[PDB]
Enzyme design. Structure first.
Site, PDB file in Angstrom:
ATOM      1  N   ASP A   1      52.396   9.372  45.747  1.00  0.00           N
ATOM      2  CA  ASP A   1      51.333   8.751  44.961  1.00  0.00           C
ATOM      3  C   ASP A   1      50.384   9.706  44.230  1.00  0.00           C
ATOM      4  O   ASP A   1      49.432  10.227  44.823  1.00  0.00           O
ATOM      5  CB  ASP A   1      50.524   7.865  45.914  1.00  0.00           C
ATOM      6  CG  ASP A   1      49.720   6.819  45.201  1.00  0.00           C
ATOM      7  OD1 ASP A   1      49.390   7.023  44.013  1.00  0.00           O
ATOM      8  OD2 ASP A   1      49.407   5.793  45.846  1.00  0.00           O
ATOM      9  N   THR A   2      50.620   9.913  42.939  1.00  0.00           N
ATOM     10  CA  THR A   2      49.777  10.812  42.159  1.00  0.00           C
ATOM     11  C   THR A   2      48.365  10.274  41.955  1.00  0.00           C
ATOM     12  O   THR A   2      47.472  11.011  41.540  1.00  0.00           O
ATOM     13  CB  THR A   2      50.401  11.115  40.782  1.00  0.00           C
ATOM     14  OG1 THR A   2      50.591   9.893  40.054  1.00  0.00           O
ATOM     15  CG2 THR A   2      51.738  11.815  40.959  1.00  0.00           C
ATOM     16  N   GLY A   3      48.169   8.991  42.250  1.00  0.00           N
ATOM     17  CA  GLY A   3      46.852   8.396  42.102  1.00  0.00           C
ATOM     18  C   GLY A   3      46.013   8.488  43.365  1.00  0.00           C
ATOM     19  O   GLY A   3      44.850   8.083  43.375  1.00  0.00           O
TER      20      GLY A   3
HETATM   21  C1  LIG Z   1      39.677   8.653  45.062  1.00  0.00           C
HETATM   22  O1  LIG Z   1      40.284   7.581  45.811  1.00  0.00           O
HETATM   23  C2  LIG Z   1      41.626   7.652  45.975  1.00  0.00           C
HETATM   24  O2  LIG Z   1      42.345   8.550  45.536  1.00  0.00           O
HETATM   25  N1  LIG Z   1      42.075   6.605  46.687  1.00  0.00           N
HETATM   26  C3  LIG Z   1      43.489   6.450  47.010  1.00  0.00           C
HETATM   27  C4  LIG Z   1      43.888   5.204  46.210  1.00  0.00           C
HETATM   28  O3  LIG Z   1      43.615   4.078  46.645  1.00  0.00           O
HETATM   29  N2  LIG Z   1      44.527   5.340  45.013  1.00  0.00           N
HETATM   30  N3  LIG Z   1      44.914   4.105  44.187  1.00  0.00           N
HETATM   31  C5  LIG Z   1      46.376   3.854  44.241  1.00  0.00           C
HETATM   32  C6  LIG Z   1      46.863   3.525  45.680  1.00  0.00           C
HETATM   33  C7  LIG Z   1      48.143   2.630  45.749  1.00  0.00           C
HETATM   34  O4  LIG Z   1      49.178   3.241  44.927  1.00  0.00           O
HETATM   35  C8  LIG Z   1      48.687   2.565  47.233  1.00  0.00           C
HETATM   36  C9  LIG Z   1      49.593   1.345  47.591  1.00  0.00           C
HETATM   37  C10 LIG Z   1      50.954   1.294  47.138  1.00  0.00           C
HETATM   38  C11 LIG Z   1      51.781   0.182  47.455  1.00  0.00           C
HETATM   39  C12 LIG Z   1      51.264  -0.894  48.227  1.00  0.00           C
HETATM   40  C13 LIG Z   1      49.914  -0.855  48.684  1.00  0.00           C
HETATM   41  C14 LIG Z   1      49.082   0.255  48.371  1.00  0.00           C
HETATM   42  C15 LIG Z   1      47.894   1.182  45.287  1.00  0.00           C
HETATM   43  O5  LIG Z   1      46.850   0.609  45.567  1.00  0.00           O
HETATM   44  N4  LIG Z   1      48.893   0.560  44.607  1.00  0.00           N
HETATM   45  C16 LIG Z   1      48.772  -0.844  44.180  1.00  0.00           C
HETATM   46  C17 LIG Z   1      48.287  -1.066  42.753  1.00  0.00           C
HETATM   47  C18 LIG Z   1      47.323  -0.322  42.012  1.00  0.00           C
HETATM   48  C19 LIG Z   1      47.030  -0.731  40.681  1.00  0.00           C
HETATM   49  C20 LIG Z   1      47.689  -1.863  40.102  1.00  0.00           C
HETATM   50  C21 LIG Z   1      48.649  -2.603  40.849  1.00  0.00           C
HETATM   51  C22 LIG Z   1      48.934  -2.188  42.175  1.00  0.00           C
HETATM   52  C23 LIG Z   1      49.916  -2.820  43.154  1.00  0.00           C
HETATM   53  C24 LIG Z   1      50.087  -1.695  44.203  1.00  0.00           C
HETATM   54  O6  LIG Z   1      51.286  -0.935  43.871  1.00  0.00           O
HETATM   55  C25 LIG Z   1      44.224   4.183  42.871  1.00  0.00           C
HETATM   56  C26 LIG Z   1      42.705   4.248  43.097  1.00  0.00           C
HETATM   57  C27 LIG Z   1      41.982   5.448  42.840  1.00  0.00           C
HETATM   58  C28 LIG Z   1      40.576   5.499  43.061  1.00  0.00           C
HETATM   59  C29 LIG Z   1      39.875   4.354  43.553  1.00  0.00           C
HETATM   60  C30 LIG Z   1      38.394   4.421  43.789  1.00  0.00           C
HETATM   61  C31 LIG Z   1      37.730   3.631  44.780  1.00  0.00           C
HETATM   62  C32 LIG Z   1      36.330   3.752  44.935  1.00  0.00           C
HETATM   63  C33 LIG Z   1      35.592   4.649  44.116  1.00  0.00           C
HETATM   64  C34 LIG Z   1      36.238   5.400  43.173  1.00  0.00           C
HETATM   65  N5  LIG Z   1      37.598   5.303  43.001  1.00  0.00           N
HETATM   66  C35 LIG Z   1      40.611   3.153  43.806  1.00  0.00           C
HETATM   67  C36 LIG Z   1      42.014   3.101  43.579  1.00  0.00           C
HETATM   68  C37 LIG Z   1      43.720   6.391  48.583  1.00  0.00           C
HETATM   69  C38 LIG Z   1      45.195   6.009  48.905  1.00  0.00           C
HETATM   70  C39 LIG Z   1      42.781   5.377  49.322  1.00  0.00           C
HETATM   71  C40 LIG Z   1      43.426   7.809  49.178  1.00  0.00           C
END
Ligand SMILES: COC(=O)N[C@H](C(=O)NN(CC[C@@](O)(Cc1ccccc1)C(=O)N[C@H]1c2ccccc2C[C@H]1O)Cc1ccc(-c2ccccn2)cc1)C(C)(C)C
Lengths: 99, 99
Positions: free
Chosen positions: B25-27
């Site tokens: 996960d690059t995000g």
């Molecule tokens: C800086 O924070 C992070 O990097 N958080 C990580 C994270 O959630 N990354 N996520 C992406 C995570 C993920 O890819 C993980 C996942 C994959 C599959 C199933 C369940 C979870 C995700 O949720 N994906 C879903 C998804 C996402 C968008 C659209 C559709 C969908 C459907 C899913 O595939 C992006 C993100 C980044 C920053 C903030 C944020 C919050 C507060 C303040 C500032 N920024 C909120 C979301 C984590 C993991 C909690 C370490």
């Protein structure tokens, strides 16, 4: 281009005539952007991540330009903390993970 | 290897002598795994995703293999929907985004 992951992979996107910053997210099935207006019909969808689910509006067949590359696909709009470019559009611009 | 994104970038990881499936996960800034046992003391951390925040246990300098690539770094453990390999470890294995 080759994007390293020392920092978050943020890129500029062009959509609905607006320019926005979005995160290239290989862990996201779909693309979801913060509140904005989009043309056409939409349907409700619940998407889940860390922390649970949020309700978003689903717009299909939307034109978007990512870091210079044009593409078309479904874009979700809702209370996402950050703009996310998911796999449905990453594939279209030929984005891959490499190591 | 080169991984396309038409399907989720799921790979096999090895931690604590056991194999698990995880998402590249690059995000994700960090690496968070589903409930499991790890050695040593842990520290508290709150991480936020699309649905809100969750509390997790932070373990440092943990040995973890990703697609055969050895890494040693911070691993978070908590109620995450799926095992996630974040940038802290993707950088250790030399992963980049390309298009
Ligand atoms: C800086 O924070 C992070 O990097 N958080 C990580 C994270 O959630 N990354 N996520 C992406 C995570 C993920 O890819 C993980 C996942 C994959 C599959 C199933 C369940 C979870 C995700 O949720 N994906 C879903 C998804 C996402 C968008 C659209 C559709 C969908 C459907 C899913 O595939 C992006 C993100 C980044 C920053 C903030 C944020 C919050 C507060 C303040 C500032 N920024 C909120 C979301 C984590 C993991 C909690 C370490």
């Amino acid at each position: 281009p080759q994007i390293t992951l020392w920092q978050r992979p943020l890129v500029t996107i062009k959509i609905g005539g607006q320019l926005k910053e979005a995160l290239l997210d290989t862990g996201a099935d779909d693309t979801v952007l913060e509140e904005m207006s989009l043309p056409g019909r939409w349907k409700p969808k619940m998407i889940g991540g860390i922390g649970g689910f949020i309700k978003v509006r689903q717009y299909d067949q939307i034109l978007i330009e990512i870091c210079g590359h044009k593409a078309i696909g479904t874009v979700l709009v809702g209370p996402t903390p950050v703009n996310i470019i998911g796999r449905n559009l990453l594939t279209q611009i030929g984005c891959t993970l490499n190591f």
